[PDB]
């Protein structure tokens, strides 16, 4: 079942419905950007739409093909944004083409916007009645001087992944540096190569046996020293 409130569910069955507004939120904080609020529509005063106090500025946007299914390939709805004045290109070259971010789609009925969007003032206002979905951007399939097309995907999508993620053994380690399994917290001693150093900026581990010998941490080495089992 959905989390839709009783009153909006009751209203949705009415024969004379109101306008349907769709608002989009693009979040890049997990990538290193900001939060952008877009709305395909504005109010009657030529102003950005005010919802829950915040303002969604008017900007071109259109979502298509939102499907949910349990069988076959996971659905990939698309999003179209007009790239005029190079606004999208301004962040595409900075945020690595908007790959890895999050998009949030909220749908709302027109009779629940804030009173400031209507000249007379809506008395039937409730800022806690909306339907929310979230997806992640996958790729920018098209980018030109007039538009831009993004593909969306479910966060849980399991394309191109393998279940057991261990290589068992090698001549090299198979973890991170200073994680919760390597368990190193000392001063800098080694860098990308096997060269002594004492700066925290260029602390790197070659993930070989020599790095462990340098860091006096061999008991946590993730490489089984077999080698000759394949030969002999």
């Amino acid at each position: 079942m959905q989390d839709i409130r009783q009153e909006t569910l009751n209203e949705c069955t009415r024969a004379e419905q109101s306008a349907s507004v769709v608002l989009w939120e693009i979040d890049l904080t997990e990538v290193g950007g900001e939060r952008y609020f877009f709305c395909n529509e504005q109010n009657e005063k030529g102003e950005p739409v005010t919802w829950q106090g915040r303002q969604y500025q008017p900007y071109p946007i259109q979502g298509s093909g939102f499907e949910l299914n349990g069988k076959g390939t996971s659905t990939r709805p698309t999003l179209t944004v007009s790239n005029l004045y190079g606004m999208v290109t301004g962040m595409a070259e900075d945020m690595q083409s908007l790959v890895g971010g999050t998009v949030v789609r909220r749908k709302v009925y027109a009779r629940f916007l804030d009173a400031v969007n209507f000249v007379n003032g809506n008395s039937y206002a409730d800022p806690e009645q909306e339907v929310i979905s979230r997806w992640r951007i996958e790729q920018c399939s098209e980018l030109s001087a007039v538009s831009a097309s993004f593909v969306l995907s479910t966060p849980t999508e399991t394309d191109g992944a393998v279940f057991p993620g261990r290589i068992m053994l090698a001549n090299t380690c198979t973890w991170t540096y200073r994680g919760d399994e390597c368990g190193y917290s000392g001063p800098a001693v080694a860098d990308e190569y096997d060269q002594p150093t004492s700066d925290i900026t260029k602390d790197k581990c070659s993930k070989c046996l020599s790095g462990c010998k340098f860091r006096n941490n061999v008991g946590n080495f993730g490489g089984f020293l077999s080698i000759n089992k394949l030969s002999q």
Partner: protein, 32 residues
């Protein structure tokens, strides 16, 4: 006009078939 529409529809059908082949061979589907 006949032939222009026919060639256009044929090329569009070829593009659609290529796109379907590409999209159905990802992880699941019927694995064409």
């Amino acid at each position: 006009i006949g032939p222009a529409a026919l060639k256009a529809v044929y090329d569009m059908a070829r593009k659609g078939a290529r796109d379907e082949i590409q999209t159905q061979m990802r992880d699941g589907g019927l694995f064409s």
